[PDB]
Amino acid sequence: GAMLRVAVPNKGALSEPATEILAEAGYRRRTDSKDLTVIDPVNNVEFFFLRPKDIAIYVGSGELDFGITGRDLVCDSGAQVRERLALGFGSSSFRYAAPAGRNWTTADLAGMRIATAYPNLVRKDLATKGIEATVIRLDGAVEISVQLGVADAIADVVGSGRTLSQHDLVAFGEPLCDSEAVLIERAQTEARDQLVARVQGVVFGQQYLMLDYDCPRSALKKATAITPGLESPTIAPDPDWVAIRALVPRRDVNGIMDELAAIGAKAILASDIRFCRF
Amino acid sequence: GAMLRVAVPNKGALSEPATEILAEAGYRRRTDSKDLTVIDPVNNVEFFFLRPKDIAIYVGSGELDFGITGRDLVCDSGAQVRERLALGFGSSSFRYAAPAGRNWTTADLAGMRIATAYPNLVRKDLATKGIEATVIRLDGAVEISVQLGVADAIADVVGSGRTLSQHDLVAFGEPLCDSEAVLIERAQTEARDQLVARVQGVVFGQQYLMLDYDCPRSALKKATAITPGLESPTIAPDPDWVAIRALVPRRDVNGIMDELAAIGAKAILASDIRFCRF
Amino acid sequence: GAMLRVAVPNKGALSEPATEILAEAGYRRRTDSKDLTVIDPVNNVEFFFLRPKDIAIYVGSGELDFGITGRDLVCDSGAQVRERLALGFGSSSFRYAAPAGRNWTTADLAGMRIATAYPNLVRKDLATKGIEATVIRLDGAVEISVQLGVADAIADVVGSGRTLSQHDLVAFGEPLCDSEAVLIERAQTEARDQLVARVQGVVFGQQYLMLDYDCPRSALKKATAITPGLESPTIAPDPDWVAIRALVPRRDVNGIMDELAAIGAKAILASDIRFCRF
Amino acid sequence: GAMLRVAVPNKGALSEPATEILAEAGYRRRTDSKDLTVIDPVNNVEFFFLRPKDIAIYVGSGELDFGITGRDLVCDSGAQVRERLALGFGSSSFRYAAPAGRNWTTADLAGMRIATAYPNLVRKDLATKGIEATVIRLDGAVEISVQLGVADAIADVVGSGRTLSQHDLVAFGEPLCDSEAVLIERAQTEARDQLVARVQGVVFGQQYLMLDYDCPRSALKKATAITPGLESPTIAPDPDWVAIRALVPRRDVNGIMDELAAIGAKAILASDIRFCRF
Amino acid sequence: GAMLRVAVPNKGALSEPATEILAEAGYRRRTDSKDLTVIDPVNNVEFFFLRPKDIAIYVGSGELDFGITGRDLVCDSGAQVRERLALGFGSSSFRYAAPAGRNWTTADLAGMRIATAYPNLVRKDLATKGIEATVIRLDGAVEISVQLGVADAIADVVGSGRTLSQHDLVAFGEPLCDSEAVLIERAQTEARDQLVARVQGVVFGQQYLMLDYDCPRSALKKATAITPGLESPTIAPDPDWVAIRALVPRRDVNGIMDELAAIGAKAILASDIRFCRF
Amino acid sequence: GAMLRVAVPNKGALSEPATEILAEAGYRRRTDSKDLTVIDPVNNVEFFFLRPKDIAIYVGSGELDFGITGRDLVCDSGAQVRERLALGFGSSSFRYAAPAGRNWTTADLAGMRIATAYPNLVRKDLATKGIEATVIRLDGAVEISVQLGVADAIADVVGSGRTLSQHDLVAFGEPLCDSEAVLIERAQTEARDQLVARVQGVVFGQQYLMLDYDCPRSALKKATAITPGLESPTIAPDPDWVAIRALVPRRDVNGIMDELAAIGAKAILASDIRFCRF
């Protein structure tokens, strides 16, 4: 019916992967790389390209139907939005951190100057612990704030952890947020579900591999525990053996394959896939 | 028998894709990138690398057996050649165009200075309309010929259309030619058909994806209308459902997949393929 | 005496040029590109690498002695800081802009939704005009805010103007700010002046060329009006002619050279320089 | 049990492919590209990154369990090591070569100055022929040693052969060694076999494609001679035809496909695979 | 007065150097790289970007005032144009060439199939020798025309000569044309001379270095024979020695410097320059 | 007279800078990047491109006249060669190093397993200290030899020191060798001195800048102590001031310039130079 309005990051580390997913999903790409909008007349969707912080606000306020942004940003925004899908890129860990030497606990955070780019996120986490501290807002590069003499500890996005160790800092406590890129919606229904199914179909193509193997009937129980599938594993025969098909995660596939080999599975074969409509 | 003689573009936008297709087809690649020839002794084919305009002429005159070049160039050459295969890259649209503001029709072209790099193509198109105009031959960059004051309208290769809008020009009329890279032959037969089948097998691997899904017998009719296949869809069972396999175009696969989902299809799964011999 | 504390942008379009100027000025470069600090023990200066918005704040509050950031950011910060030097890169124009078709004036801005990443800058400019409007804060990509339906006009950083024309917007009014990268100070004195003189010496090496020419005594008056120099032009003899030396701006040197040729100057010769201590 | 110790080349043409195979095999990648070691605590393996010549020695002497290096290097090392797997990259041919014009035979090598980076390899090959010559050790660039006037012929690594022809040299005799990257072991058993199976599973994914086709029962015999498979070809039905599945080498697949087409095979379809556990 | 119209190559090996010279000369650069025109309102010149062959024609016919193109193209065009300036890039040698083995002379060209992209150039050269041959027009890649069996010898652009030797061809005879990029004019005068002087000033900055040295009065005669200068060498004193200044070619400067050292010159010092107005 | 024979590294970090110096010195560059030799017929010099270790040997043994290689390699070779020139690139520090925690001295090296790629260098350094240790030869990557359990300390090439700290190692003692690229000769004279003077002229152009300033006669003494020059500073007048010219090192120029400013110098101006013949 009415044209759907979808926002994607214009720039930075969440942009290229997001525009890759949208192109794989069949959506019309931008005519020039300096465009901040594109209209796809075949699929009836208008795309806007914005800074990630603004994406959460305008899904929240209803000016956009969907957005792609970081989970941590959403956690920090306090916008009226629900996470509709996890996108499998841009992943990071949000962590308390402080100077090395002392053994640090969450309890040590009391009465401290804490620097972060995500003040609402942090204020909310401190309230759940019952801790009063003074939270200092930076725009980024927050892990030099303690060498700069503006803070005692930090709360910051961590990827590898190289930046922390290169600056003599140790992460402590459980992560406040485990972040990855997410498709958000405000907290034309068929069209909305259609878009979600397209995007999910691509994500599943990126995250899962198809496994084919022959397994003994003897071992079938253990095998389905090892490979449950995204959908019900196809199972068919052939004297006492069976042939199996199941989507499995790409991350774990060698470990999965070794376990199957360890319970008598044979002719184990992994292959890529492109899209799902499950 | 006798060694086949095949020409490919030496340089420019039709070269790399053509040499990619030939390598995927198993043919011996060039030993140094500054070579204009290579002999493949295993497959009994000699390759020459030439400017695209010359490729059409020498297939025409019999010095080459096959060539790879642009359809628009062939349309313009007037060489004795038949298009044996379409190659799915280098695509473009050949268009009349003129300055914006006026509403333009093909009839407005009468008595006008028309600039183009493809004069024979254009002379032939004007004759079919019954229009007399004066056609001006440029070597390229033809869309500045009207700001230069040498022409009133143009006939030119269009891709995105950015160049036209950046120069205040609007395309009008139906395209004179829809171009893409093509394998040509002059208008040793088993060997010739063998080469065509290799090259086609690669092209099909690039253009189609394999779709697997379960469909209700109820819906089978509509489903085969949605997925006819390059070859007859494989269909087999399983109470009232069936399992299907069909090659479908890569361009349309998300749209195709949504339609199948809309008629009760399930476990729809798209995967790449590399080669066909159909 | 005490080690000076200097901040530079960590990332983005103001970073590489700033670190280039500091290396040319003899300062110790970063040991790893993921470092946010470096200490130069020979020159007695500690460098911090931060987000540009934060640079202005911490020079303002005294935690830093000097910073390198954008003039527009400083105009927007309202921090207690004076511009000590202009750095000749990162230049831009800050502009009101609105949809094309209407003829726009500053007076049209009254009662309007204005989107900008620089709200304080804009609030201050509107107060000087006597205009009440509603200023909307975005984080960036502000020129799609009117196609998005969140604003009537914008106030934004403009470089080429391509983004504005690609989105059907026209800049109007005088620029609110003409921006370039600047060395700031809070609004150890010998050491501070030493650092400024180093940095200025590099900037002058980038912006000026040395001109040597022979000029008639006849024409000397007009010539010194054309070439005043950064310092007093060196002038010496040689019957009735003189030989001149003067630093001139790199931007204008061909125009300057033509004017000198037009008043009888000869053997006009421009050459680069690397550093000044003037 | 005990952590396995595996060495890979740190740098050069055997490094990136080796680290690609290890990442595809699920092993933990290096945290920084200037690291010479990484410990994978999930899979219980420690990786070291060394110069290729040293890899063979320390597998030989027991300080490493496995190494990845070149076969020619191993042939030259005389270390106590067995080749456990061939890795399908870094391939080369080790060749005698001498100046063009004369017709060269292995017998001509007697009494000659032979330059090579692989003296033990060459001394051993000469002993098997019964030839006494004087072998000269270079560190590399050995094909200029004859223009330099330090040798009469050479024994050297050959890839394309461009370097030889560009220096007026002709390869002669059979290759002393046909080299490619190999996984070596000293000449915790379950863990060792597990690592080999992972690495082999990746290599097979790189070297083979899956072929699906329909074949007449008439032709089945010839077809299985054309496609024997890495594993037993799957064969099932369907009036008089059969459907086949067999892994075939990627290098030969178009030739293989043509032969099958020539014996009445139909719907021949090649597709990639990622991993095997056979 | 009237705006000057100047054409530059749009693409290929003569484009970037030409646009570099124009930017160094102070002229307004293109706003987007896909533009075929730019108007410089400060300097009162309009630039067009065209294919090199067309540049010569439209200077010839008066639609352009100046063009930048290759000398060989001009030699081939037969357009009414005079070479106003040589630009010191795009240099090449136009050569007859034929298969190796025979000793070739210009006289051998009689009665032969000669392939070339420059037929008028070649027809004119043959007429001056009194030779009748049949000249065959290709669009390029002409050095495979003899392996293709369409020609006995060629006339073609030669740079390094690698392409010729890689295809078993030897250049013979004197070059028909020694080519480099040139500024052409049709065969508003002050403005035209102004543009030429700007462009020449840049070219001289690229081709010459300033030499400063002390020379004995004894040796002055030999020294001025070694360094005549673009302009009169500046000469001044200082017991029996003199100090010299002279622009010399960049290509020969080490040879020049050695000769001066060989006649007792001292403190010889070469330095770059940027622009001349001589 | 006889053609000089000069060797340069074929590959790696000493190659590009060496071939840059030779091209700037006017010598004929390689026709194809896969060539191991080039003959310069104008300057009467033949160039060979070899592995750096072999360069030292063949200068030593007289097969080459000059070579370019690393000082540390020469120190290690024990070839009959004298360092004729230092080339100002490829610089490094050769260092003992061991695991962090203990305070290390040279005396601690006694009875230890020391790993190094430079065993002769190290054996010689230990003999001068009177220390017996066991030196272990690696081909490279030597700083993992202690985590590998093959050595207690190392002697290795150090650049930044990142590799050492990333592997928990501390450098100790004075450097055994301070290395940079060097022009070597065996320990046709005019031609040899000519080549050295060319190469030195380029190196000086890379390492020094020209300084011009006005200095008080008052301060002249201190000023010439600050700027002694590569050659005698030119000094001339002008009431009580003087004007100075002196080549100074590029590395120290801002420090030098500040000191001059501190003793009343004015109009201090640094500029590049290209070549010297001093």
Ligand SMILES: Nc1ncnc2c1ncn2[C@@H]1O[C@H](COP(=O)(O)OP(=O)(O)OP(=O)(O)O)[C@@H](O)[C@H]1O
């Ligand atoms: N190592 C990392 N450092 C910082 N952000 C990361 C990292 N890894 C992933 N991210 C994610 O990137 C997202 C933010 O993207 P980006 O940095 O482009 O936005 P921004 O911070 O608003 O812009 P900018 O960094 O240009 O100021 C966050 O959701 C964050 O979790």
Ligand SMILES: Nc1ncnc2c1ncn2[C@@H]1O[C@H](COP(=O)(O)OP(=O)(O)OP(=O)(O)O)[C@@H](O)[C@H]1O
């Ligand atoms: N946007 C485009 N502009 C021009 N040609 C295009 C475009 N897209 C596809 N093509 C195709 O490229 C082919 C011509 O290739 P190419 O431009 O390399 O040859 P050419 O014009 O003879 O060479 P050159 O452009 O170097 O003078 C034509 O068949 C044309 O349709």
Ligand SMILES: Nc1ncnc2c1ncn2[C@@H]1O[C@H](COP(=O)(O)OP(=O)(O)OP(=O)(O)O)[C@@H](O)[C@H]1O
């Ligand atoms: N075309 C342009 N667009 C945006 N900013 C520009 C442009 N040209 C120059 N700049 C300058 O860049 C500076 C801001 O740099 P930068 O964009 O890296 O900081 P930021 O906006 O805080 O970070 P980010 O863009 O990653 O969110 C400003 O002073 C601005 O004037």
Ligand SMILES: Nc1ncnc2c1ncn2[C@@H]1O[C@H](COP(=O)(O)OP(=O)(O)OP(=O)(O)O)[C@@H](O)[C@H]1O
């Ligand atoms: N064209 C080639 N030239 C040289 N080596 C090759 C070639 N092709 C493959 N190789 C392989 O590369 C391996 C050696 O790798 P590499 O050259 O990185 O080691 P190295 O010779 O010890 O190091 P370096 O070359 O840096 O001195 C050998 O097994 C060799 O067969």
Ligand SMILES: Nc1ncnc2c1ncn2[C@@H]1O[C@H](COP(=O)(O)OP(=O)(O)OP(=O)(O)O)[C@@H](O)[C@H]1O
């Ligand atoms: N090695 C070379 N090969 C071909 N042309 C060269 C070479 N070196 C210089 N040139 C010059 O380049 C100019 C032609 O440029 P260019 O090849 O871009 O034009 P074109 O031949 O019309 O276009 P295209 O090659 O795209 O068909 C000629 O003046 C020619 O002398």
Ligand SMILES: Nc1ncnc2c1ncn2[C@@H]1O[C@H](COP(=O)(O)OP(=O)(O)OP(=O)(O)O)[C@@H](O)[C@H]1O
């Ligand atoms: N950080 C560094 N690490 C190693 N060598 C360096 C470094 N910096 C400079 N060099 C110099 O490089 C020279 C050796 O060059 P190179 O590494 O190319 O030769 P090689 O070790 O024989 O070859 P390869 O490293 O390919 O086995 C030595 O003189 C060394 O001092």
Ligand SMILES: [Mg+2]
């Ligand atoms: Mg930001």
Ligand SMILES: [Mg+2]
């Ligand atoms: Mg960020």
Ligand SMILES: [Mg+2]
């Ligand atoms: Mg062309």
Ligand SMILES: [Mg+2]
């Ligand atoms: Mg073209």
Ligand SMILES: [Mg+2]
């Ligand atoms: Mg910004």
Ligand SMILES: [Mg+2]
């Ligand atoms: Mg080596």
Ligand SMILES: [Mg+2]
């Ligand atoms: Mg090697």
Ligand SMILES: [Mg+2]
């Ligand atoms: Mg050309």
Ligand SMILES: [Mg+2]
């Ligand atoms: Mg090395």
